[PDB]
Amino acid sequence: TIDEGLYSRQLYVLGHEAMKQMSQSNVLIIGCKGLGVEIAKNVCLAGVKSVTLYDPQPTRIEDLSSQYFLTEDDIGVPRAKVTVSKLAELNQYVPVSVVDELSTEYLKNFKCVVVTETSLTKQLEINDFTHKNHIAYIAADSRGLFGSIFCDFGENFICTDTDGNEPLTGMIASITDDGVVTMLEETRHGLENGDFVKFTEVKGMPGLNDGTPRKVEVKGPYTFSIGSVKDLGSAGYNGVFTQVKVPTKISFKSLRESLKDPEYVYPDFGKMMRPPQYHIAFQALSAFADAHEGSLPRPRNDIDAAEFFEFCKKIASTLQFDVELDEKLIKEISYQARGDLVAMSAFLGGAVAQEVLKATTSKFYPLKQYFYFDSLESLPSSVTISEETCKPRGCRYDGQIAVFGSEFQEKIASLSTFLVGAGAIGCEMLKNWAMMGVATGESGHISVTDMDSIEKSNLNRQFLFRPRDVGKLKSECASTAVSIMNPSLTGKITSYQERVGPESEGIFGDEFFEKLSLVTNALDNVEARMYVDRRCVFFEKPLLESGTLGTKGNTQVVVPHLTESYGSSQDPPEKSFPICTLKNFPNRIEHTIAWARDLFEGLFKQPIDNVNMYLSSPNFLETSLKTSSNPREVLENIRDYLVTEKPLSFEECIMWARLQFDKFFNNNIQQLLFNFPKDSVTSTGQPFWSGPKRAPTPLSFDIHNREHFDFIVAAASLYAFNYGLKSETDPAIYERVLAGYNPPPFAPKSGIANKDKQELKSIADSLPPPSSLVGFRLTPAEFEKDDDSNHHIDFITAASNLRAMNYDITPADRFKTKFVAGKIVPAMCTSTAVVSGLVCLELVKLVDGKKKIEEYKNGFFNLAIGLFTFSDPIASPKMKVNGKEIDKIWDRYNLPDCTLQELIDYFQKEEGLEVTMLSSGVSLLYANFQPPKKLAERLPLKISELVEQITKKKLEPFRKHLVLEICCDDANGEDVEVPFICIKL
Amino acid sequence: MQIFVKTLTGKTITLEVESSDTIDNVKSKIQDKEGIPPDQQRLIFAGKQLEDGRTLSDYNIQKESTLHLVLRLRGG
Amino acid sequence: ALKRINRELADLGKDPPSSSSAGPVGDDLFHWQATIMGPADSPYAGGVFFLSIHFPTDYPFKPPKVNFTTRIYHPNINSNGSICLDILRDQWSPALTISKVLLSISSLLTDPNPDDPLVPEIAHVYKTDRSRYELSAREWTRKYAIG
C-alpha cells in the first residue's frame, strides 16, 4: 500500500519490501540543532512510521547558524517545540511528536535511537540499555570542521543486501563435466569468488535447474566454475544463470567496549593517522565540557587549548593508546569546538539518515563502527583568524564566525553566485547559502534558473516544495522559501524560468557573466553540464559540479588557470541496442520494452502528426514525396487515418485494437517463421535459433487471458483519445464486441515500373481536399510516464509482455516497465544532502582564493557500502607555443575584428605559424585547401562579415565576442596546437 | 607486486604488477579485467588521482596498495 | 570535435580514396555527404550510392549517424537506409576515422551476412534462391543507383 506516486524514485533505490518494513519502524532523535534537524528531515522524507523529538534546551541566537527551522522570533523557546510544527509538514504519512521527558524504559518503543549534542556519560547510559534490548543506536557529532559518527545495531544484525546491486544474470554457452561454465561470445559474468548462482533452461544437465545455489570460482572474465557435476550429466548446452545473494550476520560492540578498541572507517586514505587522533580529541572535548559546566573551549583561546591538550594526554594515557599526539591538529580541534557549519551538518545528517534507514530496513552494509571526518583544508589563510576576530558578535552567524572570523564573513556576504538548476541539489544548495549568509551584503546577489515545474514525485526529495505548490515554477518557489529561511535575502535573489543553453545567450550574456563570482551546476544531464562548463571556461569563472545516482555521488571543482575543466574527461555513454536485435530477435525484457515504445510512438504519434501536417500545409504532398524516405507509407497513413479506418464509435476502436493485435502478435511472427523456419540452419550448419535468438510462436487471441484483454483495452482507449471519443471500461462491452469477430484469412507470402506511381496518384486523389476539412484535427499522444490514467505505461507493459510471450521471455510488471521505458534516474535525499555538504565545503575554499591545487578536493562516495574518497584536481596541461608557456585550457588570443587576411598575416608574423583551418561554431570559415577563387572572395572580408555570410544569418545585437577555433602548422610543417581566438566585435 | 582496486560499486579486483609499470599498463590491465576503456578510468591512491605517463614508483605505490576506481554521475 | 573533423577532412584530401568521396555539405562540418562506388565483384557493380553522415555534438565520443540515401536491395539494409554495422552502435571507439567506416560499408556491400539479417525476406531469398537475389539486386541498382 505504498503511495508510488510519491515514493517513485525512492522505491527504485530501496524496493517495495524495504519500504514496507520501514513504514513500521519508530525513530527517536535526541537533539534538535542543525545536525539533528537535518537527520530528522531526511528521515521524515524517507517515510519511516513516525519520528519523536527530544530537546528541552531553549533556543539561542547562535543556534540559527545551521538550524533552518528556527527564526529570531523563537529565541527562548525549546528547540523541539518550535521544530516539530515545521517538520510535520514535510511528509503527511509521517507523524512527528515531542517528548518532554526521557526515561530508559521509554526507549523500548523505538526501532532506532539517534543521539546528538549529548555528553559521553549520557551516551554510555543510553547505549548500555539499547545494546542489550536489540535497539539500533547511532551517535553523531559535529565540531567546527570535524565530524564523527558511531553506529551500533546489536550483536546479531542480519543484512539481507550488502552492496545494493542488482543480482547478476547471464547466458551460458557450455558447461563442461567439471563445472567450467563459459559465457557467450564476448560476454563477462562479472562475478567474484564465493558468490552463489542458480541455473535454468540448461539442456543436458537437468540437475542444475533445480534452483540450489552453488559456489563460484572465477577463473577469468568469461569463465567460472561451480564444482563437480559428474553425476548430473556429461555436458550442458545453453541456458541462463542468476546470482543468489545470501544474508550476512554482522556483530557490533557496545560504546563502552568500543571506546577501548575502536574499529575505524577511513573516509580519506591520504590521512590514515588522524582518526586515532580524533578519537582522543572528542573524548577530551567531552571531559572538558564535563569539567566546565558543559561549556566547550572558547574560540581560538590559548588557555583553553592548553587545558584541552592536558585532557587529551590524560585520556591517551588512561586508554593505553600507543599514539603520538599531534599538538597542532588537537589544538585545532580545540579552537573550532564551538563551530557550527551548515555544510558539515548536511554532510553528517545525510550519512546518519542513511544509517537510520539501514537500521530500519536491514539493507546495505552499515558503518562499523567509528567514522571520523575532517575538512580542515577549508580553513581560510588569506584573513586573520585569531581570538579577536573569532569572538561572537551576538548574531545568527556566530557558529560560523567561530571558525572563519568576521573578515571572512564579510567576504562571504559579498558573493555574486549563479546556480543552474533548482532540483534536489539546487534546493539543498540554496538552503546552505541562506544559512551561511551568502550574498546578504550590499554587493551580494544570487541568481537561480530552472524551466521545470513542481510535480508530486519531486516532493519526496526536494524539501523546499509542498503539495500546495505542485504545478508552480521551481525557481520562484525555492527563492521564496529561502527568503523565508533567511530574511536578509529579501530582494537579493533573482529567479529565471530560462533553460541554460545556446538559445538563452541573450539573457546570460557577457554583462551577466562578468559580474559573477562562481557558478554552481545542479543539473541532471550532460549536455547542460558541458555547455555551462564551456561558458565558465570562456569567462574564467570557478565552477562547482555535483551529481548523484541512487546512493552514489560525486563533486568536482573547476578553478581558472589552475585545474582542468569538466569537459576534459570522459564518462561511459548510455547503452543502446542494435536495430536487428530489437526488430526481430529479442532476448531480454529491455528489448521488448524498447520495441513497445517504438510501437506506441508509431501507432499513436507519427500518423497523427502526418495527418495534421497534411491538413495544415497547403502543399504537403510534394514535400512528402520528394523528402520522405518512404512517401508511400505516409500516404497510406493519411488515407487510413482520414477516410478508411476512421472510427465512428468505440466498437470500431475495439475492432481496430483486435486487428492490431493480430497484426503485431500473430501475423508478423508467422511471416518470420516462414522466412526462418524453426528447423533452419545457418550457412555453417549450426541451427539458426540457437544462442541469443529465441524461436517465436504466434499468439492466438483468448479473451480470458489477462494480457490480451489489457492490450485490447489500452489500444482501444488510446485510439479513442486520438480521435477524441468516449472510451468504455466495463469488460461486458469488450466481450460482446470481440465475440462477433471474424478474422480475415492470412497466408505468409513468398515474395516474387509505373504501377507504383499509379498507386501513389490513386491514393492521392482518394484523399479528401483540405478545404473540405477545416477545423478538424487529431490529437497526437505525447508520452507521459508519471500519469497513470492515460494508458501509456499500461499499453507499453501489455505490448512488451505479449512480445515476451511470443519469444518465451519472463514478463516484467508495470513498475519495472515504467523504470525502463521512462528512463527514470533513481534518486535519494541523503545523497543530495551529502553532495550539497561537500560542494559547500569546497565553496569556502573558492571564496578564500587558494592558489595551490593540493588544497582542493574532488569527492566520490557510495552510501550503500559506506565508501568515501577524495582526490586532488588534475592540473591543466601546459604546452609550448613560439617558445612561450601556454595553458592548454585557460589561454586564448584576443584580437580585434580585423580582416581574414590581416588575421593570417598576424599569425604568420607574430607566432610564426601558418594558418590552415579557421572555424566558428559549426561552420568552416577558412581552409587551406579551398579553391583560390573562393579564398580570394572570402579573404578581404572581416571576421564578423565572413561569419554572417557563411552561416547565412546576421549576428545578434547582443553578440560582443566571437570564439574561433584555429588549426595551424609551424614553419617545418608540423601541426602545433594553439588556444582559441576571442574576436572582439 | 600485487595491488587491489576497489570500485565505487563495491567490487574488488586483484592486479599483478611491478613497481616500474606505468599507469597506462595498469589501465590496460583494468580494461582487460573489466572492459572499461582506459580513457574512462579514474584511479585514486592516497588522495592523488593517477595520471597517464607516470610510473607507480612516482606515486609511492607499494605491494598490497589499495586504489579506488571511481566515476562521475549524471543525476542530481 | 572541430579539430578532429578538420583533421579527418584534411587527411581525406591528401590522398584521394578513389572509391569514396566524403565532404561537408555546404559549410556544415558536422553534416557530410559521402559517395560509395559499388564493388566490382558484387551485384552492385557500376553503381553510385549516396550516404548521409551526421556527426554528433560529442564527436568522436559518440558514433556518427550513417544512413544510405540511395535505395539498395541488401539483407542488412532496410528501406530507411539504416545499416546493420557493429562499429556504429556500441563498438564505436574514438580511435577510427570515417575512412574506416566507409571501408567497412564497402566490405558489407561486397558480401552480405544473412545469418543475422535486418531484412528477413531478403535474407531468405539470398539463402534459398540465390539467382533471384542476384537478379533483384542488379535490377534495383540499375533503376536506383544509376542516373
Ligand SMILES: Nc1ncnc2c1ncn2[C@@H]1O[C@H](COP(=O)(O)OP(=O)(O)OP(=O)(O)O)[C@@H](O)[C@H]1O
Ligand atoms: N538545461 C537546463 N537548464 C536549467 N535547468 C535545467 C536544465 N536541465 C535540467 N534542469 C533542471 O535541473 C533539475 C534537475 O533535478 P532533478 O533531475 O532531480 O529534477 P527533475 O528532472 O524535475 O526530476 P526527476 O528526474 O525525478 O523526474 C530539474 O529542475 C531540471 O528542470
Ligand SMILES: [Mg+2]
Ligand atoms: Mg521535472
Ligand SMILES: [Mg+2]
Ligand atoms: Mg531529472
